[PDB]
């Protein structure tokens, strides 16, 4: 919905592959490079702004569609 984390599927160097509900996108790892695959990530601009784990991007995803429910 706004910022909604992603799966990061590949990671070459500085770059990751990152999945956003199938959509595959290419994402800087530059302030996260311990950033692996399986890990979630939020981006920004193009750059990995956090590293998450499912149970938390679960959580946001629930949220959003709560606030969207509410609205």
Do not use: Q, S, Y
């Amino acid at each position: 919905c706004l910022a909604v984390p992603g799966k990061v599927i590949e990671v070459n160097g500085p770059v990751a592959v990152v999945d956003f509900g199938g959509v595959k996108r290419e994402v800087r790892l530059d302030l996260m490079p311990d950033t692996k695959p399986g890990d979630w990530v939020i981006v920004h601009t193009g750059f990995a702004i956090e590293k998450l784990d499912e149970k938390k991007a679960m959580e946001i995803l629930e949220a959003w569609a709560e606030v969207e429910k509410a609205m």
